[PDB]
Design a protein around this ligand. Structure first.
Ligand SMILES: [Zn+2]
Lengths: 1223, 105
DNA sequence: TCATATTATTACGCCAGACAGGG
DNA sequence: CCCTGTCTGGCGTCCTCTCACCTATGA
RNA sequence: UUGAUUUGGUGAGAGG
């Protein structure tokens, strides 16, 4: 069964693997994030309720009044989205917050408040999201791009090689909170443990232990195990568990029980450990040279004399043993400092420590954190107890506590947001364990260690900034509060919240202007994962590994769609099936595989879960039950693609599109292209302009439907039914009764957005693709947007392309185009320019909007009214007048009248005017005369434009040939576009050839149907040929149910197929070559894909037959009459005497540094002298040169450049006396 | 025209010889009209007239007496590019050592 | 409108060059 | 007193095109 | 004597 615009033109779908999970809604990141931000969600998480339950109830410092919270709300926007874009306002909503002030008496923690008051106060306006995932910030339509940042929670990083210049590794450990102070632990090459807070000075780390009220003995209890020396009959014997001797040299005689176990000289093996455990050896008598290097654990005091024997962490000598033996402390606890495993790092750090108690530890930490200003008991204790341990200024979130408990192998995952003693001690213990050998480091590119921020999280953080500023203001007003003469808007202020949230949505590194020239480009700018932004890395610094693809990107981030240039791999784009985890990580679908039978249930995993399991490959042959047809299958275990058994796997990939994104899964024959050319192909495919006549890719992938629907450029029907079709203004849909509400009788009236400006000056336009009185279903499309054709996605157009060299006109990457491409207007795109004119009151009275234009004669009053402003629609070009806008006293009158820029033509499509109340409306103040004029240039195609296919084959269209000179085959049809075969062996993008052959076969079927329907046959022969065309070959998913198309839906389908039968070649499970040959045999075309072609010039055959087919070629928006520029003489800058830069400023070319070196490389001394003195800077030289040229005397009078005298005055404006010496 | 470029230190007599007037007031411009400040950073007497051969305030609107300076204007009378070569000097109350000769490493 | 004058983040990678510490 | 970690400064590609956004205070 | 403001500076994106 199919829907009714699905039976219009059903695309022949190759593809063998049955898909189990349909594609999710492609804008779900933006929409789910912002629906989390604004939603009335009780239990508090997450949203605006989390912000209000953190900041409220505010109580002042015993001021006996406590403003509390009830509920919030967002009213209607005063401006709907269209008139909001037209006017220039934000698309926002007012945030109505109920606030309940209760005010206490004296001595009421428990007492009832003396008075209440409550009102629905107004704080800020928050910008709502449009239904397509965009904002409208100040007239322009912007997009917040989801960030990719390091997760909160501990990270054990190594930095193995570069420091110390000696090959000795370090090991640092960063506890990254979501909000607050950063705590890092780090070794130094003396093997001492150092703490630093917020990248400040370096403190030896155990001082933080001494700041947590730990004595030295408790610290040595934590990080060391005790070895017991018992004072006995002679020589102070030792308790010896045999584990401690692992891998060391026997220094003494190891004997017990009257038996010599191990003699001196040999190392202790594990067999000797087994001998000591079998022989039950604990107590052995040691020599006095064994204790002469060990370190005491706890303190001991001489009992009778009443003084100290030794402090804790003191090494022992023989006379120290003579001190402690004669006193009466029989047990001696020593620190086992194994050189192999259990290193003495804490103990040597305690030897570095200049402190002894808790108070001096806090004084040293306070002198680290805030220097100069004195360290007193209260101040240092408040500092250190609010560094990590208060809920205000330090908060590992739920993500942070999950990562923090997971990296320490804790059992639980939910806990308190602050740290504790035990958490810092566990981070130090795991760091020491990593130094000892057990456990390993973490990598930072691993996407289980890399969280995503999105729109709701970022706006919530900015809103929390605004709320803590307004609670400091409420605490300000309340202690100065007199009652009862205030109601809660003398306390609260709507200004800081609105200021902060408009600061983020207007001027941030991620709230950025939407790439809007294409439905693909909208839908792939909204699905973007940037590594940049606040708190993340920068473009010009890092690095090599964060720019590189890591094995956790499989199914989360597209491997091949990343922009080339200065930021590669920082601006990653999200995969097709990848959702976002509850904590913000990237979870991708897999199919749960209990045993041999691969089950059709799906189950989502992130990269810290994908490592443990064994996950299969998407295309592994399984037949009729889910059993893998082989006994061994390629899977990947822990980021390592390896071959495993038939019955070991726990998950399988869902579908074979899932590695790549929605930009680079629209490329058919992706698997035959190179990776580089797929990258260039996807990045150029974002850049296509919408043509005037949208044209249905013959070789698509079937993902065109989901992109063209899910990006909101087409008018998808909300409720199904029939149609009334007034449509000149709006589609009117009568609703079927089952989908129709009992009250609100109701018929749906869709607004078509006609010719208007996009963000890239292209033309967004919707056209109805349903007739009058025609059934439509829910979810069906009604109006085709820009670059769409019956709900599919038509960026460029499909043209007949020959691969051959043609007389040099397609030399490096150029492209030679017939005249049939430019006669049919089949790339003639439509651009729209907005031009503003204002008549602000700068000085000497206000400016004026009158046709009575001066000096200039009846060449002003022309495309305007009888007395002012461009009339409505003519063919205006360059140098015309649109809005007469000139003042008197500015003879002394002048011409600021906004005219048409140089080089452009067009038709005035629209004139908007919300001018200074007097022009003879709704807008803001200040600005007076506000006249916006919308031109619409129609640019065709010309030598110099840029076209490209989908595979990375760039081209600048070189010659626009006549129809006659084209290479025609023996049937008579010219070929449209000639490309060059030499690009194909080097640039290994062989997929454009299979697209060429399969598009040739598609139009072969289209020509066959066009013959069977033009030379008109009764519909039995058409339905037989359509059935043969839709069966065609191997086991596929489509077949068709064609005998249920009522003898008319066969004919309407065959009316929509006579331009070529559309073929879906999916991404990695595409059409094989034998099916291309078999489809080329169904059409009457030659099997090789190659036709003999004659030459239009000479009429004689090209030897060695050439390839002709249909490639889907796109017109990119790098048009040549936006790049052509020239300057002889005009205006310059102010500070310098050199010319201005750019095209919108009529400026000249920067003759840079390497061009000066290139002229020095020749003998061009005079060319360089005029290149930097006369042509550029020296004012007397250039006026004398212009007069010398127009007299007919090519001679320069050089002089000295002005910018060098600017250099002299800037150097001389220091204390520097730079001069110019003798004649 | 000229051989080598010589660089040396700037004596206070040399800086007073470069100068054309002490810049006292920090007031940049009027900002509500179009006129500058007399006598602030952007002065008239210390540097020159904004307009070419015009007293900014009011006298000499032809080409006869280029130079006269009335008391109502406290303005020189030369070219529009004359201010680009003229520099002012600030009489620093308290001596301040140069940062280029104190932190050059 | 017309003078008043500066605070609560961290996440590069060498590579010279100068400096207090110690055998 | 001659090695020495350690700290501080000083580099880090040219050319071009499009867009938006710009200090608070205040009797 | 016959006319006028971006360069300034930031941020984001793009081309070769
Ligand atoms: Zn004068």
């Amino acid at each position: 069964v199919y829907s009714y615009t699905e039976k219009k033109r059903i695309r022949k779908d190759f593809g063998k693997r049955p898909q189990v999970l349909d594609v999710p809604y492609l804008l779900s990141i933006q929409l789910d994030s912002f629906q989390k931000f604004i939603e009335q969600d009780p239990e508090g998480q997450y949203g605006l309720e989390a912000a209000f339950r953190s900041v409220f109830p505010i109580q002042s410092y015993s001021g006996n009044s406590e403003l509390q919270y009830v509920s919030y709300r967002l009213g209607e926007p005063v401006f709907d989205v269209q008139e909001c874009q037209i006017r220039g306002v934000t698309y926002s909503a007012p945030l109505r917050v109920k606030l309940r002030l209760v005010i206490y008496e004296r001595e009421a923690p428990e007492g009832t408040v003396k008075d209440i008051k409550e009102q629905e106060v107004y704080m800020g306006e928050i910008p709502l999201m449009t239904d397509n995932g965009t904002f409208v910030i100040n007239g322009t339509e912007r997009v917040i791009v989801s960030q990719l940042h390091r997760s909160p929670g501990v990270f054990f990083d190594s930095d193995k090689g570069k420091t110390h210049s000696s090959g000795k590794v370090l090991y640092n450990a960063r506890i990254i909170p979501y909000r607050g102070s950063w705590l890092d632990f780090e070794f130094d090459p003396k093997d001492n443990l150092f703490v630093r807070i917020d990248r400040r000075r370096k403190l030896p780390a155990t001082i933080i232990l001494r700041a947590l009220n730990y004595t030295t003995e408790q610290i040595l209890d934590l990080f060391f195990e005790k070895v017991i020396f018992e004072i006995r009959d002679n020589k102070l014997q030792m308790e010896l568990v045999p584990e401690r001797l692992r891998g060391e040299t026997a220094s003494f005689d190891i004997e017990a029980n009257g038996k010599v176990y191990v003699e001196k000289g040999r190392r202790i093996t594990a067999r000797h450990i087994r001998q000591l455990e079998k022989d039950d050896v604990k107590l052995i008598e040691v020599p006095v040279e064994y204790i002469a290097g060990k370190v005491v654990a706890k303190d001991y005091i001489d009992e009778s004399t009443g003084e100290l024997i030794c402090a804790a962490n003191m090494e022992l000598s023989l006379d120290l043993l003579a001190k402690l033996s004669q006193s009466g402390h029989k047990r001696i606890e020593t620190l086992f400092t194994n050189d192999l495993d259990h290193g003495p790092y804490i103990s040597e750090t305690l030897r570095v420590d200049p402190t002894n108690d808790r108070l001096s530890a806090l004084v040293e930490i306070y002198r680290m954190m805030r220097p100069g200003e004195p360290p007193t008991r209260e101040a240092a204790e408040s500092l250190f107890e609010n560094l990590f341990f208060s809920e205000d200024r330090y908060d590992l979130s739920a993500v942070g506590r999950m990562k923090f408990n997971r990296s320490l192998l804790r059992e639980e995952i939910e806990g308190s947001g602050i740290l504790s003693k035990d958490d810092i001690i566990d981070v130090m213990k795991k760091l020491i364990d990593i130094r000892n050998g057990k456990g390993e480091v973490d990598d930072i590119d691993h996407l289980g260690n890399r969280r995503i921020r999105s729109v709701g999280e970022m706006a919530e953080n900015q809103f929390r900034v605004g709320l803590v500023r307004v609670e400091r203001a409420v605490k300000e007003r309340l202690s100065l509060g007199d009652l009862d003469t205030l109601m809660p808007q003398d306390m609260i202020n709507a200004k800081p919240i609105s200021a902060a949230v408009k600061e983020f949505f207007g001027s941030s590194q991620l709230s950025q202007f939407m790439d809007q020239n294409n439905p693909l480009s909208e839908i792939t700018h909204k699905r973007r994962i940037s590594a940049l932004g606040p708190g993340g890395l920068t473009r010009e610094r890092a690095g090599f590994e964060v720019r590189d693809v890591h094995p956790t990107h499989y199914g989360r981030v597209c491997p091949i769609e990343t922009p080339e240039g200065p930021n590669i791999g920082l601006i990653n784009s999200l995969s097709v099936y990848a959702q976002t985890n509850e904590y913000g990580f990237l979870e991708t679908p897999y199919r749960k595989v209990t045993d041999g039978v691969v089950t059709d249930e799906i189950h989502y995993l992130s990269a810290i879960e994908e490592g443990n399991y064994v996950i299969a490959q998407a295309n592994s042959n399984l037949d009729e039950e889910g059993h893998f047809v082989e006994d061994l299958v390629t899977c990947r275990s822990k980021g390592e693609s390896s071959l495993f058994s038939r019955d070991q796997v726990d998950y399988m990939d869902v579908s074979t599109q899932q590695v790549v994104s929605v930009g680079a899964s629209l490329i058919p024959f992706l698997e035959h292209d190179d990776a580089n050319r797929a990258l260039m192909g996807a990045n150029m495919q974002r850049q296509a302009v919408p043509t005037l006549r949208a044209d249905k890719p013959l070789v698509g992938t079937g993902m065109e439907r989901a992109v063209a629907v899910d990006s909101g450029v087409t008018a998808v029907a909300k409720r199904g039914g029939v149609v009334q079709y007034v449509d000149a203004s709006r589609i009117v849909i009568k609703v079927n009764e089952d989908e129709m509400y009992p009250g609100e009788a109701g018929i749906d009236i869709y607004n078509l957005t006609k010719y208007t400006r996009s963000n890239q000056n292209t033309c967004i336009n919707q056209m109805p693709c349903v007739s009058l009185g025609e059934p439509v279903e829910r979810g069906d499309v009604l109006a085709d947007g820009p670059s769409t054709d019956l709900g599919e996605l038509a960026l460029g157009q499909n043209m007949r392309v020959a691969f051959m060299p043609w007389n040099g006109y397609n030399f490096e990457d150029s492209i030679l185009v017939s005249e049939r491409v430019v006669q049919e207007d089949r790339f003639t795109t439509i651009h729209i320019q907005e031009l503003a004119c204002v008549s602000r009151d700068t000085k000497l009275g206000p400016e004026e909007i009158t046709a009575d234009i001066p000096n200039v004669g009846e060449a002003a009053l022309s495309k305007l009214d009888e007395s002012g402003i461009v009339y409505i629609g003519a063919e205006v070009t360059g140098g015309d007048i649109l809005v007469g806008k000139v003042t008197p006293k500015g003879s002394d009158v002048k011409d600021s009248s906004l005219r048409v820029p140089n080089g452009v033509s067009g038709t005035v499509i629209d004139v908007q005017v919300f001018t200074r109340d007097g022009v003879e409306d709704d807008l803001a103040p200040g600005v007076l005369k506000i006249v916006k004029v919308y031109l619409a240039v129609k640019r065709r195609i010309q030598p110099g434009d840029k076209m490209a296919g989908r595979h990375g084959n760039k081209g600048v269209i070189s010659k626009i040939n006549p129809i006659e000179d084209m290479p025609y085959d023996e049937n008579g049809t010219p070929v449209d576009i000639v490309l060059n075969p030499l690009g194909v062996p080097s640039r290994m993008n062989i997929g454009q050839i299979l697209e060429t052959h399969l598009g040739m076969a598609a139009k072969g079927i289209g020509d066959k149907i066009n013959a069977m329907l033009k030379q008109q046959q009764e519909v039995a022969k058409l339905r037989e040929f359509i059935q043969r065309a839709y069966d065609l070959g191997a086991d596929v998913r489509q077949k068709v149910d064609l005998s249920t198309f009522s003898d008319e839906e066969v004919m309407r389908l065959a009316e929509n197929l006579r331009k070529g039968m559309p073929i879906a070649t999916p991404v990695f499970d595409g059409a094989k070559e034998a099916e291309i040959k078999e489809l080329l045999k169904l059409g009457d075309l030659p099997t090789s894909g190659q036709i003999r072609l004659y030459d239009g010039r000479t009429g004689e055959q090209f030897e060695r037959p050439v390839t002709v087919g249909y490639m889907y070629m796109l017109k990119l928006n790098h048009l040549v009459d936006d790049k052509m520029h020239a300057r002889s003489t005009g205006s310059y800058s102010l500070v310098t005497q050199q010319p201005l830069g750019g095209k919108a400023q009529f400026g000249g070319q920067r003759f840079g540094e390497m061009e000066v070196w290139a002229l020095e490389a020749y003998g061009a001394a005079y060319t360089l002298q005029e290149m930097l003195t006369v042509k550029s800077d020296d004012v007397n030289g250039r006026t004398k040169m212009y007069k010398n040229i127009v007299d007919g005397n090519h001679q320069m009078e050089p002089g000295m450049p002005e910018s060098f005298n600017v250099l002299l005055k800037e150097i001389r404006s220091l204390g520097i006396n730079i001069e110019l010496e003798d004649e | 025209e000229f051989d080598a470029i010589k660089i040396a230190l700037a004596s206070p007599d040399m800086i007073r010889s470069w100068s054309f007037g002490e810049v006292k007031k920090p007031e940049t411009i009027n900002y509500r009209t179009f006129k500058p400040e007399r006598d602030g950073l952007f002065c008239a007497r210390i540097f020159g007239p904004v307009k070419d051969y015009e007293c900014l305030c009011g006298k000499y609107k032809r080409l006869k007496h280029r130079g006269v300076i009335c008391e109502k204007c406290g303005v020189e009378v030369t070219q529009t590019k004359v201010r680009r070569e003229r520099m002012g000097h600030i009489e620093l109350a308290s001596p301040t050592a140069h940062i280029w000769f104190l932190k050059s490493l």
